[PDB]
């Protein structure tokens, strides 16, 4: 369930900051890869979040702009982890700026993006099991 992978990822990024908001191996491997990615690929994430200026009125377009750029010329697992971590970081930034109502909005946008643009690639490339073997 794509909603549940989104909700568990976001819940985790927010709990790491002190904010409260087997399939278990997938969630666990995704948490570890995103934590790893946020340290190792600091430069790529800083470029992604550089032109954000997060407000409720611009958030949808900021998310759509970054995710369209990320996947424009293809899908791989690296970009999928980066998608979860960029969504996570937008949620953390939303709470930090007293825009916590964006968290549910971002979760919706991430679930729709997975269902409509990433589901086919995941299913054609060995599913979440291939992710766990490769990154786990």
């Amino acid at each position: 369930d794509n909603r549940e992978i989104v909700m568990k990822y976001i819940s985790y990024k927010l709990s790491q900051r002190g904010y409260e908001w087997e399939s278990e191996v997938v969630h666990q491997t995704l948490r570890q890869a995103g934590d790893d990615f946020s340290l190792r690929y600091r430069r790529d994430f800083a470029e992604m979040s550089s032109q954000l200026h997060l407000t409720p009125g611009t958030a949808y377009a900021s998310f759509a702009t970054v995710v369209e750029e990320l996947f424009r010329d293809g899908v791989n697992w690296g970009r999928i982890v980066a998608f979860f971590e960029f969504g996570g970081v937008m949620c953390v930034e939303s709470v930090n700026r007293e825009m916590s109502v964006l968290v549910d909005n971002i979760a919706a946008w991430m679930a729709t993006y997975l269902n409509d643009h990433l589901h086919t690639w995941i299913q054609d490339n060995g599913g979440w099991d291939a992710f766990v073997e490769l990154y786990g």
Binding site: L70, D73, R79
Partner: peptide
């Protein structure tokens, strides 16, 4: 196309 450092492992 390699545009991000995470693309290199793929």
């Amino acid at each position: 196309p390699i545009r991000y450092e995470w693309d290199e492992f793929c």
